[PDB]
Amino acid sequence: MNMAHTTTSMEIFGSPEQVWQLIGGFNSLPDWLPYIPSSKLTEGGRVRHLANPDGDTIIERLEVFNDKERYYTYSIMNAPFPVTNYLSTIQVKEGTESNTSLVEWSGTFTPVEVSDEEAINLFHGIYSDGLKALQQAFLDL
Amino acid sequence: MAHTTTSMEIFGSPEQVWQLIGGFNSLPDWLPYIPSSKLTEGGRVRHLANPDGDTIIERLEVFNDKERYYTYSIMNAPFPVTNYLSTIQVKEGTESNTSLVEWSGTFTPVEVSDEEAINLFHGIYSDGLKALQQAFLDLEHH
What we know:
The structure is a homodimer.
Chain A: E1 4-12, H1 16-23, H2 29-32, E2 39-42, E3 47-50, E4 58-66, E5 71-78, E6 83-94, E7 101-111, H3 116-138
Antiparallel strand pairs in A: 1-7, 2-3, 3-4, 4-5, 5-6, 6-7
Pfam families (chain A): Polyketide_cyc2
Protein name (chain A): XoxI
């Protein structure tokens, strides 16, 4: 119990549903994250193996999933990150217009071998870069 | 709309039973009726084959690992229903190492009576829950 927090929200030029169709897949990070080469599912779709572009790997577990409320929460089973009790959620909220959406990527975790600020900086950077790339891909009809 | 539910106690902790049936793509590991399954859409959609080679496409609506349940709908299948919704949940049993699995369904029967729609799905649910009960009964050791 330490639990650091970080979040980042960003407007995407696409209807919430359309945006969720592209990012709501647990194994679909490679379709929108320019930092993920490939993703593999295990346990009938409950576990994803991300092939990190550095030899290391990230294994995560789907914790919660709701199609219509457009969101999914997941936890880390095995990754090189310097934290524990990692829990992250990515949700597609209402945009400012009906053809717009606001994506939120949050995460709670316990820093280990790094300060709260350093871990907060790490994932905030990962989240923000992820959403900026997504913003880029959608305003590319 | 029509509704139907089946329950079955299995000799396995709620967590064990769920490790085996909680995967959206794991039906062929325990449901005789679905010999083959495939996932698309990053895992949200599954393509099933029934014994007669018919294709069944369903979509994951809700999934909760901790509470051991998932809800899904039918996008397209040869079944005579519409507005199909089904949820499978693994509840606590009478012993810390047994559990109660529940498979429920709600649907609008099309071109068939409610009775006929209920029998079909109840039959499928029963088929799978019974195989599941037999699977664990095969303890085999300690």
